[PDB]
Amino acid sequence: VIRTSQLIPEMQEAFFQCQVCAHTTRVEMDRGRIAEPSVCGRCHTTHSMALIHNRSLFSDKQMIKLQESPEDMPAGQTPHTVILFAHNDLVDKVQPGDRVNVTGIYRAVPIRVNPRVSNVKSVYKTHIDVIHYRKTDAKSEKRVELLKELSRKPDIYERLASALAPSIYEHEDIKKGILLQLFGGTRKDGKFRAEINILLCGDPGTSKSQLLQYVYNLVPRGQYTSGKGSSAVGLTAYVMKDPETRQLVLQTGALVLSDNGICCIDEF
Amino acid sequence: LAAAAEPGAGSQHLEVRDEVAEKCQKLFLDFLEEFQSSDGEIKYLQLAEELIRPERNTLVVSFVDLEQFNQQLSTTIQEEFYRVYPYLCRALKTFVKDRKEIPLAKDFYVAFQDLPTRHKIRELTSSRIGLLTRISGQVVRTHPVHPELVSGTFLCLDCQTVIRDVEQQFKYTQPNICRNPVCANRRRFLLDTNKSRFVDFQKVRIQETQAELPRGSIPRSLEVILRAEAVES
Amino acid sequence: NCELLATCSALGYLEGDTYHKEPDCLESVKDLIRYLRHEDETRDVRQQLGAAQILQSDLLPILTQHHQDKPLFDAVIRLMVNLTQPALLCFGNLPKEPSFRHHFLQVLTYLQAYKEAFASEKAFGVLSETLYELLQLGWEERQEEDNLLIERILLLVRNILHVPADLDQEKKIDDDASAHDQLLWAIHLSGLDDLLLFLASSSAEEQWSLHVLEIVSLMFRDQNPEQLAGVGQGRLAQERSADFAELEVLRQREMAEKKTRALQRGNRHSRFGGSYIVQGLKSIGERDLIFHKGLHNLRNYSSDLGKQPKKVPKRRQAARELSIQRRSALNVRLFLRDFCSEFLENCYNRLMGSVKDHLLREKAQQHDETYYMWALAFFMAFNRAASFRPGLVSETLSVRTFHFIEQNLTNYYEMMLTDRKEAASWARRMHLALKAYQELLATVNEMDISPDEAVRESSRIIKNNIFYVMEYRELFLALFRKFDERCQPRSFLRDLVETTHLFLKMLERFCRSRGNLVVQSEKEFNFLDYLKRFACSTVVRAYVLLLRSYQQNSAHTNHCIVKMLHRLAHDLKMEALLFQLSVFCLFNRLLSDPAAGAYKELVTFAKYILGKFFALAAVNQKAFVELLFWKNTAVVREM
Amino acid sequence: RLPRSKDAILLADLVDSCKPGDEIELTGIYHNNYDGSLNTANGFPVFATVILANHVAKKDNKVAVGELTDEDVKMITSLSKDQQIGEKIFASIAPSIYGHEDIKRGLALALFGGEPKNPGGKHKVRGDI
């Protein structure tokens, strides 16, 4: 998924009211166009029925822009992309960056040459009406009962610390410190931080970055970013024009996004 | 002349009436006239005292007080809020008019606080259109206050008849017909800006608060419209 | 304009709450009266003085604070009567062209403004006090000076009560004080109501009977007798609970309709495609129907799913009821109930006798019998409501009133059919006559129920007279056979049907109780051959026309309709008259109604006649063609 | 916080009553008219607003030379005849500062200023201190 639009309301039933006598009627949607009443029924005035927008009925719609997977692209080619349209409950189930198997009906629709003229291009636009989404990159008492006795097992501290990052050769006190950072103190109120701050030092080519990436994959509300100015997501907060909308958005940095977690800062 | 000489003399009048909205008007006026504080004395009658002042036009009502008055009335208002809102405003005008010293051209607005349920920005789907809703958000940008036309007074140019209280859609709207029943004019009308009624208007962008933002998402922004007493607050 | 401005300035000015009149008020007021008398036909001075608001700013303060200055007071009263002159009198009629209609609307607007201003109790207090100290003198002590002042005072009150409600501010919701309600409250607090009761009950001042009748008519313009008679101490709780219950009923109906529409459309968006061929259904050509409006619609398919309805042309547009009913302020309703009670007990007989004397002597305006018939309907209905006492209305119970009402109703019927340019006005006058006739026919039933053998005797006498004379029987058929939806409202049709039901109820019970064979140079009679006159197509056409609004009809009205149709079907065996396609569409709606359980009588009658039709159809397939048209004696050929 | 702003129309001899950067007081009619551009920008029938200026007064120039009345110039000319006016003018420079008489003298001389000169139209010399 490359982008996901704002929620688009699609009219399902138009509500008309007579501006002369307040008599109301309802019109059903015929393949995207309204059969507007040209006359009122109670009275008989012509062109008196006005569309009451917020008494009409609407349903959710959303546009999604979906790129072919990197694992599926042919060698050295720029990726292809399709447009999906989801409606009702399937609208708010997919975010940008997700990988999905989408089942839907492959539609083809005309596009008018300019908005005030009904001539259409011979070459049709295509999109997929979404019928089903399946995410394919996602990866209680029965746990509490295990954890209660495992907590009173001997040297559970050492067991958890050694469980941290099995893929690297062991630095006992580093792993112990990261474990105590994960658990943290107790937050109470005055103003004292329960958060624990840890710093790792060493040459490039040490296991410090592997530790950072591991615990970022582990912890909830985690973040991973570089102190270098070329980082994917910044540490500080900033304001930017949302390019697909042009309206301002306050992008709070990783330190604010990790307000109840661990912020991993590589190249500090 | 005679009891039978009354054929609808000189009016193009509206004859279908929104029964639910008018029941809301009547029962909300009863609520304002009868609901009383912990020490009695009719709350909202005392708070209507300040509406005599210039640049005060909004009465803020507690939705839990409305619920205590009657569950069905509060449920109806919550479900059909945008439908019944001008009728609640007319009820407030009828309530405030017991002072007898009010400027009659003045508009009055009902505002609601202490709504029990809160909704996320992600939950503002089409099912919530027209319903009374409470949201939390962080203001990102506020635009200038403008005067918005709420009801235009128009002059019919080819019979000189004045049409009052032409209510505005999301488009600037002239009279659909002339108020003179035999006049055939339907597009030649002139707005009288001095005799029309305006409201203070301000639009603000908000986004999801830091607490409510789902993990990994871009912040979802929303456009909010503030009116009358609420602008620049 | 400027000269009027100068004189209006010369009247004086208000300061805080006290008006300081100039010494030249008399000549300036005479000049204003002169300008009004020398008006253009457009009534320019009327419009200009209304725009200047001198009635609100000068004349009411002068009237209320300098009423001891008698020449100025008399001049102001005459000027105010002139200014408050109703617009229909000002222009003669409703103008047919835009310019005079704009001027009419201007004068009407300023009249509505005057009515808004006149709700102050001080003005009516001064009017009541001056009328009281005038009427304190004996009639023989009066001269033209005082008699003309009584005329001008009562005409001012009449003019202010007559004014139509503004279309802008007639949107008041029930239980609220409209401008008319506030005006009636001003009359109540000033005590002019008691003076009106005195004028109605006085034998000496009978000369003002027509005036007082018009005041009372315009006072009780909006009210309904039974609804008003039901008012009392404990009404606030009743009306509050009723409002909450009706709110919930309306909400449940809207929810049910929303669910039905949500099922009728699918759970897929409208641009979700798909097309079907309905193989059995031939299209307008010979090819099979191609359906595009979604599979959900084919459960209750109809060919008119996407069709625009037709513009009813101006001539065929049905008549619509002129006003909605609103429950007026409770204080005003209590005051009007007390007024009506005291008036009925103390005033009504003498006032109605005086008005009948005026109509006999022919010293009344052209249509004052409409006020007479209004008073009959309203006050006899109020009498029967609550404590019925026929002594309070015994001046009305004579057969002469039946004869007078029947003559007026036939006259209005003829004039409606002939004077086509105000046929609706003649229909309204005929509606008043019909309601008066209905109330007499209801009152004799109440006399039968009442315990007094004397009123039972006189009830028998009047029933014998009415059922003997032919016009009372033939008038219902005459009305049905030339009723027109184009001209007469559905409220009239309701009243006609209910009056016919009550009349046939009484006549059937009378003939069932005893023979009484001779009727009309007399001839024999029986109720079955009378009922056979109601077997015409036009009357049943009108009855089903009223039946179409069964959702909005009252339960009593629905009972009247279904009882008459059951009488024609079950007892006269005229089901083929009612075998009709439009009537079958109405039955289709009745059977498909979600609230069909609330209409158990109607659906049972519909299923009875439908079963009879399908039996006949199984025997003979030409009945399907017979459904398509109204008929005469094919009612027997089908049989 | 971002500042609010208004358009104002200056007509006839009110033009060039001010320049960009001037602090002003503006008396005028607050006027509104329909603007389809604002209506389509906002989605609601919003009316454009402008001030029809009647009087512009720079908050800088609370007193202009044109504002001086015959009483004012009579006061000034008669006060100049005191013959101790130089000491009075020097003392009036920052009256809440003790001492610094040389500073007050220099600032008075700079505040009143000299005259620019251009002998022969080809050699300009400044008059400001």
Add this chain to the structure above:
DNA sequence: TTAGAGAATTGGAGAGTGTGTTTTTTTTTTTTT
């Protein structure tokens, strides 16, 4: 009592008139380099 032939009024088909359109580079300036 129904309905059909002649005259007048209203619905709307269609003929005629007017309106709107098809990332890039050099330079400055403040802050940050």
Add this chain to the structure above:
DNA sequence: CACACACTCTCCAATTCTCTAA
């Protein structure tokens, strides 16, 4: 420029009113 929309006016004929015969 020129090809679609948007709007008004006019004429034509189809429906309803009025008067007469079956």
